[PDB]
Paper text:
It consists of TIP5 (TTF-I interacting protein 5), also known as BAZ2A (bromodomain [BRD] adjacent to zinc finger domain protein 2A), which is the largest subunit, and the adenosine triphosphatase (ATPase) SNF2h (sucrose nonfermenting protein 2 homologue).
The crystal structure of BAZ2B BRD with acetylated H3K14 revealed sequence-specific interactions of the BRD. The histone peptide was well defined in the electron density map, allowing unambiguous tracing of residues 12 to 19 interacting with the acetyl-lysine binding site. These salt bridges are particularly important in determining the binding specificity. An additional hydrogen bond was formed between Nε-H of the arginine side chain and the carbonyl of the E2137 backbone.
Residue numbers in the entry:
A (entry chain D): 12 to 19
B (entry chain A): 2060 to 2165
Amino acid sequence: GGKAPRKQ
Amino acid sequence: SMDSKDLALCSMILTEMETHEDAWPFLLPVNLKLVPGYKKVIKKPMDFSTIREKLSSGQYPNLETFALDVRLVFDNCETFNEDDSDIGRAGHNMRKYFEKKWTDTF
Ligand SMILES: [Zn+2]
Ligand SMILES: [Zn+2]
């Protein structure tokens, strides 16, 4: 939710 | 065991951060169920409403402990998210705001 994970 | 004046100033910094336009990712706890993977990367989640609770309930014995939890919010965000994203930039901007506001207050 708004996230932009470095992993996956 | 923060005195009245310190409690007051930390509470004001927290309200200022809560009001800031780049505060949107940090207002409430990350929802561990809809961000699967979060908890395996992040050992200690932290967000501003938890900080508010801990401040109001006397859980910070001094200024440093409070600043430590504020930094953990932005260290978590930087560990988890790409810098080149709205959320990554939001974290870097709030860190900058906090550190300047901390220095200028204390
Ligand atoms: Zn990356
Ligand atoms: Zn950085």
